[PDB]
Short mmCIF file of C-alpha atoms and ligand atoms in Angstrom, two decimals:
data_model
loop_
_atom_site.label_atom_id
_atom_site.label_comp_id
_atom_site.label_asym_id
_atom_site.label_seq_id
_atom_site.Cartn_x
_atom_site.Cartn_y
_atom_site.Cartn_z
CA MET I 1 124.72 35.33 19.34
CA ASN I 2 123.08 38.14 17.42
CA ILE I 3 122.79 39.36 13.80
CA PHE I 4 125.81 41.64 14.08
CA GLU I 5 128.05 38.85 15.37
CA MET I 6 126.64 36.47 12.84
CA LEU I 7 127.42 38.74 9.93
CA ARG I 8 130.79 39.82 11.37
CA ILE I 9 131.76 36.17 11.22
CA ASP I 10 130.44 35.71 7.63
CA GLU I 11 131.89 38.94 6.16
CA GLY I 12 135.05 39.49 8.25
CA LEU I 13 136.40 43.04 8.65
CA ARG I 14 138.83 44.79 6.26
CA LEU I 15 139.82 48.48 6.52
CA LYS I 16 141.15 48.83 2.97
CA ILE I 17 139.19 48.41 -0.24
CA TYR I 18 139.07 44.79 -1.35
CA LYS I 19 137.25 42.65 -3.84
CA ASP I 20 134.43 40.41 -2.66
CA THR I 21 133.71 36.86 -3.82
CA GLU I 22 132.28 38.23 -7.05
CA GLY I 23 135.14 40.61 -7.76
CA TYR I 24 133.27 43.72 -6.55
CA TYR I 25 134.93 46.51 -4.66
CA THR I 26 134.02 46.32 -0.99
CA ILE I 27 135.20 47.63 2.38
CA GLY I 28 134.63 47.23 6.13
CA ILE I 29 132.23 44.45 6.96
CA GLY I 30 130.92 43.41 3.57
CA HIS I 31 129.94 46.96 2.56
CA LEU I 32 129.65 46.85 -1.24
CA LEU I 33 130.95 50.02 -2.82
CA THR I 34 130.41 49.51 -6.55
CA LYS I 35 129.93 46.83 -9.13
CA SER I 36 132.03 48.97 -11.51
CA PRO I 37 135.49 47.68 -12.47
CA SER I 38 137.07 51.07 -11.73
CA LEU I 39 139.02 51.44 -8.54
CA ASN I 40 138.50 55.16 -8.78
CA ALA I 41 134.76 54.78 -8.99
CA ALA I 42 135.10 52.76 -5.79
CA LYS I 43 137.32 55.33 -4.06
CA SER I 44 134.78 57.94 -5.08
CA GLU I 45 131.83 56.01 -3.65
CA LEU I 46 133.89 55.43 -0.49
CA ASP I 47 134.54 59.08 0.28
CA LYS I 48 130.92 59.85 -0.48
CA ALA I 49 129.81 57.21 2.01
CA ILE I 50 132.16 58.31 4.76
CA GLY I 51 132.10 61.96 4.24
CA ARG I 52 135.84 62.62 4.05
CA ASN I 53 138.85 61.97 1.79
CA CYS I 54 139.65 58.36 2.61
CA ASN I 55 141.95 57.41 -0.24
CA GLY I 56 140.77 53.83 0.06
CA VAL I 57 141.17 53.41 3.80
CA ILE I 58 138.89 53.65 6.82
CA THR I 59 138.91 53.38 10.60
CA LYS I 60 137.24 50.62 12.63
CA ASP I 61 134.65 53.04 13.99
CA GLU I 62 133.86 54.05 10.39
CA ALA I 63 133.55 50.40 9.33
CA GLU I 64 131.18 49.79 12.27
CA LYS I 65 129.04 52.79 11.35
CA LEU I 66 128.60 51.49 7.78
CA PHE I 67 127.79 48.13 9.30
CA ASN I 68 124.98 49.50 11.44
CA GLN I 69 123.55 51.42 8.51
CA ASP I 70 123.70 48.32 6.41
CA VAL I 71 121.96 46.04 8.89
CA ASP I 72 119.32 48.65 9.36
CA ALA I 73 118.73 48.94 5.65
CA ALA I 74 118.52 45.18 5.18
CA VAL I 75 115.90 45.02 7.89
CA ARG I 76 113.86 47.83 6.51
CA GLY I 77 114.14 46.34 3.04
CA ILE I 78 112.60 43.13 4.33
CA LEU I 79 109.81 45.02 6.08
CA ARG I 80 109.00 46.93 2.89
CA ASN I 81 108.89 43.81 0.74
CA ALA I 82 105.52 42.13 0.26
CA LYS I 83 107.13 38.75 -0.32
CA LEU I 84 109.62 39.03 2.52
CA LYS I 85 107.75 40.63 5.34
CA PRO I 86 105.22 37.89 5.84
CA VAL I 87 107.96 35.33 6.04
CA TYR I 88 110.08 37.33 8.38
CA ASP I 89 107.12 37.97 10.66
CA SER I 90 106.42 34.27 10.82
CA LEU I 91 109.92 33.37 12.01
CA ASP I 92 111.40 32.87 15.48
CA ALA I 93 114.23 35.20 16.50
CA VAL I 94 117.12 32.95 15.46
CA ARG I 95 115.70 32.20 12.05
CA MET I 96 114.93 35.88 11.39
CA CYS I 97 118.67 36.35 11.54
CA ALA I 98 119.17 33.86 8.79
CA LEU I 99 116.82 35.80 6.57
CA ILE I 100 118.58 39.03 7.35
CA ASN I 101 121.89 37.38 6.48
CA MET I 102 120.66 36.47 3.00
CA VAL I 103 119.29 39.92 2.28
CA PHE I 104 122.52 41.47 3.45
CA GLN I 105 124.47 39.30 1.01
CA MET I 106 122.21 39.14 -2.07
CA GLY I 107 119.83 42.05 -1.69
CA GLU I 108 116.08 42.13 -1.28
CA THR I 109 115.41 41.45 -4.90
CA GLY I 110 117.63 38.42 -4.92
CA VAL I 111 116.15 36.85 -1.85
CA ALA I 112 112.56 37.56 -2.95
CA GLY I 113 113.35 35.31 -5.98
CA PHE I 114 113.57 32.26 -3.67
CA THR I 115 109.80 31.81 -3.93
CA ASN I 116 109.52 28.14 -3.14
CA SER I 117 112.03 28.21 -0.31
CA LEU I 118 110.16 31.21 1.09
CA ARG I 119 106.84 29.46 1.05
CA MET I 120 108.41 26.47 2.75
CA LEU I 121 109.92 28.55 5.51
CA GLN I 122 106.53 30.17 6.06
CA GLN I 123 104.96 26.75 6.48
CA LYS I 124 107.81 25.78 8.82
CA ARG I 125 108.89 22.75 6.71
CA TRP I 126 112.52 23.16 7.80
CA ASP I 127 114.13 20.18 6.18
CA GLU I 128 112.31 20.80 2.93
CA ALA I 129 113.29 24.42 2.82
CA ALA I 130 116.95 23.50 3.45
CA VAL I 131 117.09 21.16 0.48
CA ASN I 132 115.40 23.69 -1.72
CA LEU I 133 117.65 26.49 -0.50
CA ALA I 134 120.64 24.31 -1.54
CA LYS I 135 119.54 24.12 -5.19
CA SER I 136 120.92 27.56 -6.01
CA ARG I 137 123.82 29.38 -7.42
CA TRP I 138 124.28 30.91 -3.92
CA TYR I 139 124.95 27.52 -2.34
CA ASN I 140 127.20 26.53 -5.24
CA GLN I 141 129.26 29.71 -5.20
CA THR I 142 129.58 30.27 -1.49
CA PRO I 143 128.94 26.87 -0.02
CA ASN I 144 130.39 27.34 3.51
CA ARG I 145 128.41 30.44 4.20
CA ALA I 146 125.30 28.99 2.57
CA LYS I 147 125.58 25.86 4.77
CA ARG I 148 125.82 27.95 7.92
CA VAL I 149 122.75 29.95 6.96
CA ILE I 150 120.77 26.91 5.84
CA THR I 151 121.70 25.07 9.03
CA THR I 152 120.38 28.00 10.94
CA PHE I 153 117.02 27.89 9.10
CA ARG I 154 116.87 24.10 9.58
CA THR I 155 117.50 24.08 13.34
CA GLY I 156 116.61 27.44 14.79
CA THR I 157 119.83 27.24 16.86
CA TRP I 158 123.25 28.92 16.51
CA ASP I 159 125.07 25.60 16.27
CA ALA I 160 126.66 26.42 12.89
CA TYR I 161 128.24 29.57 14.22
CA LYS I 162 129.63 27.85 17.28
CA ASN I 163 133.37 27.36 17.42
CA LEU I 164 134.10 30.15 14.85
CL1 CL W 201 121.20 23.93 -8.59
CL1 CL W 202 131.65 30.24 1.58
#
């Protein structure tokens, strides 16, 4: 399993503009277009991102391109962040994926706010971090995805993504 497959499973793939769990206009594999309530703002952002007149629809190759760009940016965002980088560098390869997953979903800023969970992951107190990670709006709003990610941090295995 790898980060791309992990996120493909958590975000799904949709070739027409849709609303995410928060009601924000999104497309492809979890690519957020705008937090604005206007569908035209979204269609505007979309064409701008793809570089052609899409009218709300994209191809699978286009969705995959946005996906690569997005994974890349999440990674870089972690490397640039003083609170994130040290944690990420301390993690094994499976667990790094869990951190990338969070940043992809909630942004750098959002994840960097998980101060105590972050310190616990750094110290490798897996069970403790899992419980702390659970005391969040994230877990309460998107419990199934949060459980998969937390299970990943807790075990360092892909068990939670097996059979999906
Ligand atoms: Cl809570
Ligand atoms: Cl969920």
